[PDB]
Amino acid sequence: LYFQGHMSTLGHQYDNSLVSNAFGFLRLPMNFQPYDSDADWVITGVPFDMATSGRAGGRHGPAAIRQVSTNLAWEHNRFPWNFDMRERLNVVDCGDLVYAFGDAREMSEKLQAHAEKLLAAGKRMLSFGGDHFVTLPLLRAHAKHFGKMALVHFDAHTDTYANGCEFDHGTMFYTAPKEGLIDPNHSVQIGIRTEFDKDNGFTVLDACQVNDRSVDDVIAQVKQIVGDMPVYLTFDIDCLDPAFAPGTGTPVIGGLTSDRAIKLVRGLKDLNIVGMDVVEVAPAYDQSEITALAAATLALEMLYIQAAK
Amino acid sequence: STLGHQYDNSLVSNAFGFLRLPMNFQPYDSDADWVITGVPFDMATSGRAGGRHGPAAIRQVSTNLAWEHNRFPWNFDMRERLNVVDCGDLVYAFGDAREMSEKLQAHAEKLLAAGKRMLSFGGDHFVTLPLLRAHAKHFGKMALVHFDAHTDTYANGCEFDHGTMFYTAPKEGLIDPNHSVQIGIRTEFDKDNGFTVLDACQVNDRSVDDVIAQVKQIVGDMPVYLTFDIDCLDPAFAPGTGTPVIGGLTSDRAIKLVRGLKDLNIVGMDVVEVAPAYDQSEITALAAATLALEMLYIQAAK
Amino acid sequence: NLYFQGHMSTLGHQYDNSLVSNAFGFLRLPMNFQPYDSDADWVITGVPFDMATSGRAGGRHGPAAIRQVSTNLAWEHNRFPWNFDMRERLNVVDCGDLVYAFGDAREMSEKLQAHAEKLLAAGKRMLSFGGDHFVTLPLLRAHAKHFGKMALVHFDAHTDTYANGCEFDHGTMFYTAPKEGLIDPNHSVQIGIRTEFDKDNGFTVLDACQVNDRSVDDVIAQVKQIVGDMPVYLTFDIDCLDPAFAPGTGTPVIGGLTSDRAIKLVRGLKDLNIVGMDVVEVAPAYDQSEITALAAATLALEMLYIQAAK
Amino acid sequence: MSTLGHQYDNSLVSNAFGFLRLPMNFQPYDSDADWVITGVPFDMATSGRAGGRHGPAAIRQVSTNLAWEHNRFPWNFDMRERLNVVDCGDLVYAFGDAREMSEKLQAHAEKLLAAGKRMLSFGGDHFVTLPLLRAHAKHFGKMALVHFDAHTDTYANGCEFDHGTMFYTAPKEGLIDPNHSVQIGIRTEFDKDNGFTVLDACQVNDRSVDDVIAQVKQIVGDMPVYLTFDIDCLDPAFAPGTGTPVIGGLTSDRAIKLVRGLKDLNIVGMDVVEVAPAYDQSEITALAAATLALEMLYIQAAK
Amino acid sequence: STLGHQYDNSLVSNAFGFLRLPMNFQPYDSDADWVITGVPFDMATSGRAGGRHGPAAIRQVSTNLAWEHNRFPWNFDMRERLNVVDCGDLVYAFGDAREMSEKLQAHAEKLLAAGKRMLSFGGDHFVTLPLLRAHAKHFGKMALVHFDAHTDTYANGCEFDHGTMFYTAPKEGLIDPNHSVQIGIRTEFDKDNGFTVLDACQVNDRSVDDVIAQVKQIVGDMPVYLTFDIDCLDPAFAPGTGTPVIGGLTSDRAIKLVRGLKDLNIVGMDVVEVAPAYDQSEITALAAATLALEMLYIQAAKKGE
Amino acid sequence: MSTLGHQYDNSLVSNAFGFLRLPMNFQPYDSDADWVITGVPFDMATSGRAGGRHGPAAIRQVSTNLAWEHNRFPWNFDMRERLNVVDCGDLVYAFGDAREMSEKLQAHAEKLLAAGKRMLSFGGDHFVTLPLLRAHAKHFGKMALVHFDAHTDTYANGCEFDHGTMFYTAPKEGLIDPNHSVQIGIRTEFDKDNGFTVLDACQVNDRSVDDVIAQVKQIVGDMPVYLTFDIDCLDPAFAPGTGTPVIGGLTSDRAIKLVRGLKDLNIVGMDVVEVAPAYDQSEITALAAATLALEMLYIQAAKKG
Ligand SMILES: [Mn+2]
Ligand SMILES: [Mn+2]
Ligand SMILES: [Mn+2]
Ligand SMILES: [Mn+2]
Ligand SMILES: [Mn+2]
Ligand SMILES: [Mn+2]
Ligand SMILES: [Mn+2]
Ligand SMILES: [Mn+2]
Ligand SMILES: [Mn+2]
Ligand SMILES: [Mn+2]
Ligand SMILES: [Mn+2]
Ligand SMILES: [Mn+2]
């Protein structure tokens, strides 16, 4: 009942409402010292958007994902699954990373040291952004513990820009391969629909072709691409068409549906995913929490494919 | 209709009754074939409230549809085949859910006993239960065609719970689950009842024509009650609802499905869970309004 | 008076105590789409028109928004702070919205003037909902023929005395109205003005800067003096209110009146002989939680109460 | 210690959980708390717009704007130095059952008061105040009501669960004394010949802060006070996020100054109600409620 | 077109001309191949107004696209092939629709005569009628490739009505209905007027290639005027529009259907009916911005390297 | 004019480019301008909500509501007739590099002031003012700060790029004299024991505009004044579009009257900061900022004569 959500309400009463007792993601228990806990998975918020080239507001993403997640908490077995992920995984929400707002360098180092300490304690990580730069420190900690990783990357942009400043949310996947964190030749970038480089190692499955092909065919290609490398899964929510995810800093039309998106994440269940994150929710631009809702449903789906093991 | 009873070609002005249809606040002894009733109720919601403003938002946006003499893609005017009146909204003591339930059933029972039929606007989905209780008394046991992200077959809810109507309605002999279909479902459901659950995942993958064919086989020749929860539509098309769930139907798939149910003997129908407080540029109200008009056009198709 | 109190404006003719449902006619007053031969003392007309706007359009939705939000004021049997019910003292019907070819401002002008003259020539008085402020000029033309030259009690951030610009221009009515002998500038006051105006015309401009500092009683005393004892036409542009209170308008100007000051000022005009009145420039596309519409509905209701006070 | 790694969060954004990032205590009855914050996610008794059920969460979320202030303006101490405040979460009741809410909130309130704890409560619609008054009156006896609202809510022929009937019922049950009670900001039809003293928005906006405050102190005398604040007391310009808005209301300046000047009153319990986030604009209603809520703890801390 | 003529790689700053292109308020005598004109006008609307803010909304949001050297999925920069200038917005007395109509045509005739081509941002769809009057003088009778939820072939109506241009234009001999296609229609339409209607229902169920294959067959060898009404897109993608109709196109299918008209002789074009007061997080304006950029790219593609 | 064909645009909508439809001058250093408007699209220093980067563009777009007034109320002349004002667009820095912003803004500010141009700057968060003070202090010497805000921003234990620290760093670096400086509208925890005179929101609301202006004039005396206006000085009802809102602020009425009354002061530079359009409601925050911006140009034109 602790690790379920029966235990994070007033008087520890099971809150059946899709509204009340909205604190931790999915009403999962708060543990602000997660390093010595009995958690299998530790949810972290990264309230950061200093590395944005478009709209800011990403700093409020972790809160929005948590707030809207009460819509999913009532499902004992989250559809369409035949078990409860809370019975299989012990998940805690450790709150948001504390850093000096206006110091991206302090954010970077403290986030890297946070992950390094979790991973060294045998805890796995589901992380909420924040702009997509937060994924770089996370990959620096993950590469140290799990080795070089295949990147499964849901996005409208490839973020492989070579001539940006240090704190730039469009330069993580130029920097990660350069530092030997990820292998481009085993990495896949799904839903791309902005200018990208073709003759790097990355396999780009653009939104045009992904919206035309079947989910099972895209999945089969992804399964082959990654091989047997440990996967880091990163979902930029601007992968979804702005009709489904208006609340992003860099929106691009001709994106994926929320249906196609959840089906693709659902289908990655057989892979070795060591870490994952959902980034770039900007609630200042969200409409009736639909962007936040997509991020939270995808976040819960990521936990369910780990529980599927 | 309008000031000076002048034909209003605008998509804006003289927004009163749904589709600028005549207001008849005493519709029981009227010449009407079909009666539009608003149920301004959301006390049985488990998610967001705001459903109480549902009927108003659906009426206001319906001016967008009114100018169409023949509504696309139909070859006739449904107003030339049906006398439809808008009888206003149910008056009940707000905060008294029991009084709502009693007054809605009596209203419906009085309408049906006058040989009138009912297109109802919610309001949360609990309003369907009083509507089913009255329809059952006049039309007997019914087949349920139920568009939704949720099955609403919960057995441990309080009396006024918008997730319990289709646990209670089978028990009360109002509907036959074995001839009932549930379309758009994408939240935890009990597989081991009579209902055929056509989940959003498969309905989005399958063809519209092969979904329709299967619905027809299930319902058979039973008289249908057509209930449309608007959170069936993906929050991208229907943000203005109390319990949104991602991975839902497009408005295109939704209208095509409702359009292809014309051959069924549909005795009653409603559109529920429109929450204008959460709606964006009236796109949810519009979908609810357009689907409601489609329901009158499939009745007119007879 | 049950018909005119809104006991017959709901399903089964049941009194709706809720601030939500049966939102049709303003304040749930009965719909009369042929109001000319009715028992109505006062007739409410929507003018869904914004073609004459210089800023944002969307004024055309003003009438509908004012009606929908007005259910918030219906539950009060005696509207505060009055000790009677205006619905029991006045027969008030809502005749709906003016039907005109959208994109034809001339037809709007002619049909509105024809509609108004027919109401006045039937012994009815008019409370009109805009729409942009140009709707006042057709209404002033109808009123001028029936009651004679009037005193304009004008609430606005703008004087709208522009002697240039095209015919269908919502900043020109009160240059045109004096020229056609519809109003007397000498007995006219413009309240809330905080945009460039002509000082040396006959109008008395009580700018928002001084109106915000001065007492209500003192502004009221001055307005009473300016009008004299001529018949008054009361036009209220909602953008008179600060954007804080009325964000839903086409031409917002900061440093406006509070809703508290505006409702008090109209309340203090009760002694004046107001022969016709309107509320204009509600643009619901730019409104925020119906706060502009609510202001327009309350002020419009106050205009009916200061007629009922007599 | 309500942040990751128990670090001091100087931002006005991060770690937005308990009100003002105060410690979460879901079993606060046997705790060390002087004051307990409860959320009541309820809006079934609403006559206008619903959406009050999200009130508690929106007040908590926006309260990150106020937490960075060690001495919240304009005070010369920290209320966390003098008071031990805890956020006990939201009342768990069956959504659709108004009776379950009422009984469980009274039981919650009665256990807190019997345990020596005092209650700041966020609504939710104003009906929640009656179960809270029922609890308070058992423990503290008959009370004076300092009531901020656009409405007097003294309706006599409403249904059981009506957010406009509490202050007909509360004198009827001997919970409050109208003769020592005041209703500040009323600008809607009210009954004149009840014991209540109504300081309507019209006279309050015209009169000075000091002369209004002095009159309120005269009325209450030395009676134990229950302070209740319906946010629609504020003008829709300042509080657009509410179920039943009325124009010609109080400014946030005048409102915070009135609450700040009630500090020498014997206030035994208080609440802030009718925040409806669905109708809010950039959280300014939530912020006003949240700021008023902290002000109420500071006037308690000043003692 | 930035402070100190520095390259602004941000998706935010220096949002003046469409895609930060140079402003040329007197473009007639310039080196321009393609001139962008804002027509801030919505007086002919029968639904909501606010289309007057369309051009500005399209310009502001266009910063999201400027950073792309080669706009996806193209293999060239359209700016390296076409000299493009934004000439600002048409200046007419607000409340005078005839002045707008006369000045928009007069402006259009001057550009065409000087050897400039036109990409025009609306504004309600009536702006297309004065444009076809200028284009039909310079290019003769044209084929209309029409993206819309409405056919706008309404006989009757007033003079200035955004649902009548394509009843008026054939009568005056600006367009040939028999070589004209109307894609995305999902409201009452006239079946026998020469126009080939491809309704949203069939468009959504058919393949992009097979619709493109048919559109080529219809327009023939005629010079094409491409007019995109943004309400062609489903309100889920284009909520900021005066007359929304449900069951529209995805932005995906829309850009895919335009992208596949690259071989057609498109002489002029416009994007209309963006009403920013009803838009949500600039998604309608962004669709209008992205589609406008695509229209320049199918001209940059059909023009050589 | 800055319109299609250089025509007079009397509309409050169209040709929305430079602030108040003033001419765009991207190289203003050698121009005939008296006053230059610069956008600083930067919000990286914020401790609350971000969005300030879009502030400059929002202020420009809303300023069309003010341009039609030849003599802006309640003035008896045109500032555009007395002052030569240009908009030089927005500062171009690598987004995510706060250091580059600071250095490039100072160098830009020093170059303008070295050429005899005066600065009206739009933020962006309030940190942008520290680079501006460094530049002004080099050309004018130590200045009296007239500072409208809900916050004093004198925090001594923040990171380098922090929007709540400028007026601790500024007096330390000899840019401003606290003893001749005033902070108007404060309603948050503040240090009382610094040289600054704090006129908190509660007292300013209770006092007459006359007696407050009288106090400010005495404090500054005859030192060169830098007028910096954080828009959150206004109550969130008037300015919801801000990053760190605080209830119980000034009305837009009181705020303009207070600025209007500073006309006799020697104000050498000025800025308006912390407009976050993501949190604005029907542009009312941008309008207030744009109107207060225009008022600052009028009190300069008034003093100039
Ligand atoms: Mn990314
Ligand atoms: Mn991205
Ligand atoms: Mn349902
Ligand atoms: Mn449902
Ligand atoms: Mn006016
Ligand atoms: Mn005006
Ligand atoms: Mn109340
Ligand atoms: Mn109240
Ligand atoms: Mn069209
Ligand atoms: Mn259209
Ligand atoms: Mn500041
Ligand atoms: Mn500040």
XYZ file of N, CA and C in Angstrom, chain A residues 203-305:
309
model
N 20.177 7.086 -37.396
C 19.065 6.702 -38.306
C 17.867 7.610 -38.010
N 17.508 8.480 -38.958
C 16.392 9.462 -38.824
C 15.141 8.877 -39.489
N 14.122 8.557 -38.684
C 12.759 8.174 -39.144
C 11.855 9.407 -39.036
N 11.719 10.156 -40.134
C 11.038 11.480 -40.175
C 9.522 11.291 -40.020
N 8.830 12.317 -39.513
C 7.385 12.306 -39.179
C 6.557 11.909 -40.408
N 6.914 12.431 -41.587
C 6.244 12.146 -42.885
C 6.119 10.629 -43.086
N 7.235 9.897 -42.980
C 7.293 8.428 -43.216
C 6.669 7.691 -42.022
N 6.922 8.155 -40.792
C 6.429 7.517 -39.531
C 4.895 7.583 -39.495
N 4.304 8.684 -39.976
C 2.830 8.898 -40.016
C 2.204 8.084 -41.158
N 3.019 7.573 -42.089
C 2.572 6.772 -43.262
C 2.706 5.273 -42.959
N 3.781 4.869 -42.273
C 4.114 3.446 -41.989
C 3.306 2.952 -40.784
N 3.293 1.632 -40.569
C 2.669 0.962 -39.399
C 3.599 1.083 -38.189
N 3.030 1.010 -36.983
C 3.767 1.086 -35.687
C 4.701 -0.130 -35.586
N 4.205 -1.322 -35.935
C 4.947 -2.611 -35.843
C 6.189 -2.575 -36.748
N 6.094 -1.941 -37.924
C 7.203 -1.853 -38.914
C 8.287 -0.901 -38.391
N 7.893 0.253 -37.839
C 8.818 1.231 -37.189
C 9.514 0.532 -36.014
N 8.746 -0.181 -35.183
C 9.239 -0.911 -33.976
C 10.320 -1.913 -34.398
N 10.037 -2.731 -35.418
C 10.934 -3.795 -35.929
C 12.272 -3.183 -36.364
N 12.232 -2.032 -37.045
C 13.439 -1.292 -37.505
C 14.232 -0.815 -36.282
N 13.549 -0.227 -35.291
C 14.153 0.277 -34.018
C 14.861 -0.883 -33.304
N 14.187 -2.031 -33.168
C 14.709 -3.242 -32.474
C 16.055 -3.656 -33.082
N 16.162 -3.636 -34.415
C 17.382 -4.039 -35.170
C 18.478 -2.983 -34.973
N 18.127 -1.698 -35.093
C 19.074 -0.542 -35.036
C 19.859 -0.579 -33.718
N 19.171 -0.722 -32.579
C 19.780 -0.625 -31.216
C 20.688 -1.837 -30.964
N 20.355 -2.999 -31.538
C 21.102 -4.258 -31.347
C 20.886 -4.821 -29.953
N 21.965 -4.972 -29.173
C 21.922 -5.442 -27.760
C 22.614 -4.419 -26.845
N 22.837 -3.190 -27.330
C 23.371 -2.060 -26.523
C 22.316 -1.649 -25.498
N 22.710 -1.250 -24.265
C 21.763 -0.674 -23.310
C 21.195 0.641 -23.863
N 19.868 0.785 -23.846
C 19.135 1.933 -24.458
C 18.946 3.027 -23.403
N 19.179 4.290 -23.777
C 18.596 5.474 -23.094
C 17.484 6.039 -23.985
N 16.265 6.106 -23.445
C 15.040 6.564 -24.154
C 14.734 8.008 -23.741
N 14.747 8.944 -24.693
C 14.488 10.388 -24.449
C 13.322 10.840 -25.336
N 12.216 11.266 -24.718
C 11.000 11.760 -25.414
C 10.893 13.281 -25.247
N 11.284 14.023 -26.287
C 10.917 15.451 -26.478
C 9.455 15.480 -26.934
N 8.600 16.216 -26.219
C 7.116 16.163 -26.390
C 6.705 16.919 -27.664
N 7.593 17.736 -28.251
C 7.339 18.414 -29.555
C 7.485 17.401 -30.701
N 7.771 16.131 -30.385
C 7.570 14.967 -31.290
C 6.093 14.903 -31.699
N 5.181 15.073 -30.733
C 3.717 15.193 -30.978
C 3.456 16.458 -31.798
N 2.544 16.377 -32.770
C 2.046 17.549 -33.538
C 1.498 18.575 -32.546
N 1.755 19.891 -32.744
C 1.256 20.930 -31.838
C -0.246 20.878 -31.507
N -1.051 20.193 -32.328
C -2.488 19.927 -32.082
C -2.654 19.092 -30.806
N -1.701 18.194 -30.533
C -1.698 17.262 -29.372
C -0.815 17.815 -28.246
N 0.239 18.564 -28.588
C 1.217 19.140 -27.634
C 1.518 20.593 -27.995
N 0.553 21.526 -27.818
C 0.811 22.949 -28.047
C 1.823 23.553 -27.058
N 1.885 23.022 -25.832
C 2.706 23.559 -24.729
C 4.167 23.149 -24.826
N 4.834 23.490 -25.936
C 6.297 23.310 -26.146
C 6.927 24.636 -26.587
N 8.241 24.768 -26.381
C 9.017 25.988 -26.673
C 9.332 26.136 -28.152
N 9.437 25.018 -28.878
C 9.788 24.968 -30.324
C 8.800 24.053 -31.043
N 7.555 24.516 -31.301
C 6.555 23.702 -31.994
C 6.832 23.584 -33.502
N 6.530 22.418 -34.085
C 6.690 22.119 -35.540
C 5.473 21.310 -36.004
N 4.769 21.783 -37.038
C 3.539 21.129 -37.583
C 3.938 19.833 -38.298
N 2.961 18.956 -38.549
C 3.145 17.671 -39.252
C 3.810 16.633 -38.362
N 3.438 16.605 -37.078
C 3.997 15.690 -36.063
C 3.158 14.437 -35.905
N 3.481 13.625 -34.893
C 2.778 12.353 -34.573
C 1.505 12.663 -33.777
N 0.513 11.771 -33.851
C -0.670 11.748 -32.948
C -0.207 11.216 -31.587
N -1.003 11.421 -30.534
C -0.750 10.856 -29.182
C -0.991 9.341 -29.212
N -1.859 8.879 -30.122
C -2.174 7.444 -30.360
C -0.932 6.730 -30.912
N -0.369 7.238 -32.013
C 0.838 6.667 -32.671
C 2.014 6.693 -31.688
N 2.126 7.763 -30.894
C 3.215 7.997 -29.915
C 3.208 6.903 -28.840
N 2.078 6.724 -28.146
C 1.929 5.748 -27.022
C 2.152 4.328 -27.556
N 1.683 4.041 -28.776
C 1.810 2.715 -29.442
C 3.288 2.403 -29.709
N 4.083 3.416 -30.073
C 5.534 3.268 -30.377
C 6.310 2.998 -29.082
N 6.019 3.743 -28.008
C 6.669 3.581 -26.670
C 6.278 2.213 -26.101
N 4.991 1.862 -26.197
C 4.415 0.560 -25.758
C 5.183 -0.590 -26.424
N 5.595 -0.413 -27.685
C 6.222 -1.458 -28.518
C 7.714 -1.635 -28.266
N 8.332 -0.780 -27.440
C 9.785 -0.837 -27.103
C 10.011 -1.684 -25.841
N 9.015 -2.478 -25.429
C 8.958 -3.139 -24.095
C 10.043 -4.218 -23.963
N 10.504 -4.796 -25.077
C 11.435 -5.958 -25.090
C 12.899 -5.490 -25.066
N 13.157 -4.179 -25.167
C 14.530 -3.599 -25.192
C 15.071 -3.463 -23.764
N 16.396 -3.328 -23.636
C 17.114 -3.065 -22.359
C 17.260 -1.547 -22.189
N 16.239 -0.896 -21.621
C 16.191 0.579 -21.384
C 16.661 0.851 -19.948
N 17.874 1.396 -19.794
C 18.563 1.589 -18.481
C 18.107 2.910 -17.847
N 17.780 3.911 -18.670
C 17.271 5.225 -18.227
C 16.378 5.858 -19.279
N 15.525 6.803 -18.876
C 14.581 7.495 -19.795
C 14.123 8.826 -19.188
N 13.667 9.751 -20.039
C 13.165 11.087 -19.622
C 12.084 11.575 -20.596
N 11.217 12.470 -20.111
C 10.209 13.231 -20.907
C 10.471 14.721 -20.664
N 10.815 15.476 -21.714
C 11.323 16.878 -21.605
C 10.437 17.831 -22.417
N 10.662 19.136 -22.223
C 10.255 20.260 -23.111
C 8.766 20.604 -22.957
N 8.096 20.130 -21.904
C 6.724 20.602 -21.546
C 6.853 22.031 -21.002
N 6.217 22.997 -21.677
C 6.163 24.431 -21.307
C 4.716 24.803 -20.989
N 4.253 24.610 -19.731
C 2.834 24.755 -19.387
C 2.212 26.141 -19.627
N 3.032 27.189 -19.763
C 2.593 28.566 -20.095
C 1.920 28.591 -21.474
N 2.246 27.624 -22.340
C 1.739 27.510 -23.734
C 0.809 26.298 -23.883
N 0.564 25.554 -22.800
C -0.328 24.365 -22.802
C -1.783 24.846 -22.816
N -2.688 24.020 -23.349
C -4.148 24.290 -23.421
C -4.890 23.113 -22.778
N -5.520 23.347 -21.622
C -6.299 22.346 -20.844
C -5.433 21.116 -20.534
N -4.154 21.339 -20.206
C -3.194 20.329 -19.678
C -2.988 19.162 -20.657
N -3.275 19.326 -21.955
C -3.244 18.195 -22.936
C -1.786 17.814 -23.233
N -0.877 18.793 -23.308
C 0.586 18.568 -23.480
C 1.116 17.810 -22.258
N 0.848 18.338 -21.059
C 1.211 17.744 -19.751
C 0.638 16.325 -19.641
N -0.604 16.121 -20.096
C -1.319 14.817 -20.011
C -0.605 13.779 -20.885
N -0.176 14.173 -22.090
C 0.558 13.312 -23.049
C 1.892 12.873 -22.431
N 2.617 13.814 -21.818
C 3.929 13.604 -21.158
C 3.781 12.612 -19.997
N 2.736 12.778 -19.180
C 2.447 11.952 -17.983
C 2.035 10.536 -18.407
N 1.190 10.413 -19.436
C 0.716 9.111 -19.980
C 1.907 8.356 -20.584
N 2.793 9.066 -21.291
C 4.040 8.506 -21.884
C 4.997 8.086 -20.761
N 5.143 8.919 -19.725
C 5.975 8.650 -18.526
C 5.502 7.358 -17.848
N 4.190 7.223 -17.628
C 3.566 6.024 -17.003
C 3.779 4.804 -17.908
N 3.717 4.993 -19.231
C 3.922 3.918 -20.240
C 5.367 3.413 -20.151
N 6.329 4.330 -20.005
C 7.777 4.020 -19.853
C 7.989 3.120 -18.628
N 7.279 3.386 -17.526
C 7.343 2.578 -16.277
C 6.748 1.187 -16.530
N 5.678 1.108 -17.326
C 4.905 -0.137 -17.584
C 5.715 -1.107 -18.455
N 6.520 -0.601 -19.396
C 7.368 -1.448 -20.293
C 8.571 -1.980 -19.500
